[PDB]
């Protein structure tokens, strides 16, 4: 009856918990980039100016 | 010279901040909906059982 | 009648909107990572003179 | 030779590797609508009786 329900439920948190991971490690190197980016603004500055 | 880049870091600055605001809406919003999708899971397993 | 009609027309809205966030985003993400290529392209220009 | 070209190299990577992993992360948004989409019509069928 309710089993195909309970199924989807059942592998929409997993699909969730595992979107969730993914959007941590997209975050993570996010940031890692911007840290590239950063380093790249620091020498445009000191020479610009 | 250093100028243009500059500039572009600039707005990247504002972009990322801005797309970190709207990830923080959409996963409030992505909780709020799972609250919903337990709300029918609940349902479903008095019913199933 | 039920609680499941409430219920999945609280989905269907949660979802709609959820939805048009995330093209929302996906649009911003996008127009931010244009950014970081004429950064990255403006910076191999500096290097070769 | 200089700093820079280092520094838009990495850049380089670092952007093809998350647009690969955001890519990566959509389908797999994607994939979980899909199963919303699925409970909500399955809990409306129910809801006809």
Do not use: P, V, Y
């Given at each position: 009856?309710?089993?195909?329900?309970?199924?989807?439920?059942?592998?929409?948190?997993?699909?969730?918990?595992?979107?969730?991971?993914?959007r941590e490690?997209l975050q993570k190197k996010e940031s890692?980039?911007?840290?590239?980016?950063?380093?790249?603004?620091?020498?445009?500055?000191?020479?610009?100016?």
């Amino acid at each position: 009856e309710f089993s195909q329900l309970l199924a989807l439920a059942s592998l929409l948190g997993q699909q969730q918990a595992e979107i969730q991971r993914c959007r941590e490690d997209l975050q993570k190197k996010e940031s890692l980039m911007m840290e590239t980016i950063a380093k790249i603004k620091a020498l445009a500055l000191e020479h610009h100016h």
